[PDB]
Design a protein around this ligand. Structure first.
Ligand code: BEF
Ligand code: BEF
Ligand SMILES: [Mn+2]
Ligand SMILES: [Mn+2]
Length: 128
């Protein structure tokens, strides 16, 4: 994928954002911004430029399922890749997110290999 692709990484806790930012760096993506909830995220996204979203689920103000839904229902960003990265591991949660249009779904805790594999699966599916 284009190493200039701009990422938005969303989670209400810094620890996970920091893990993801560093992994993306390892992979060669340095264009990376962070948000703390779904509202914060939409704000940054509306500022334009983003090519990929990685997002947590449980967050105040707007959770990640709502953020995913919002993104997919906006005409300007409806096809934006959205990778869920979350502690929610129940099959019903995965169904809900998949049905809502998730590009992928990774369960915390995750290894560096898992994140890289799931990211690449999305690249390949979208011809990126
Ligand atoms: F807070 Be997340 F859903 F792990
Ligand atoms: F927008 Be969803 F994928 F129906
Ligand atoms: Mn924090
Ligand atoms: Mn959270």
């Amino acid at each position: 994928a284009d190493k200039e692709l701009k990422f938005l990484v969303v989670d209400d806790f810094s620890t996970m954002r920091r893990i993801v930012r560093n992994l993306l760096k390892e992979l060669g993506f340095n264009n990376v911004e962070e948000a703390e909830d779904g509202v914060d995220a939409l704000n940054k996204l509306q500022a334009g430029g983003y090519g990929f979203v990685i997002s947590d689920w449980n967050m105040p103000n707007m959770d990640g399922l709502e953020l995913l839904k919002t993104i997919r229902a906006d005409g300007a960003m409806s096809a934006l890749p959205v990778l869920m990265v979350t502690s929610e591991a129940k099959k019903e949660n995965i169904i809900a997110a998949a049905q809502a249009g998730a590009s992928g779904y990774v369960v915390k805790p995750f290894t560096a290999a898992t994140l890289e594999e799931k990211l690449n699966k999305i690249f390949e599916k979208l011809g990126m």
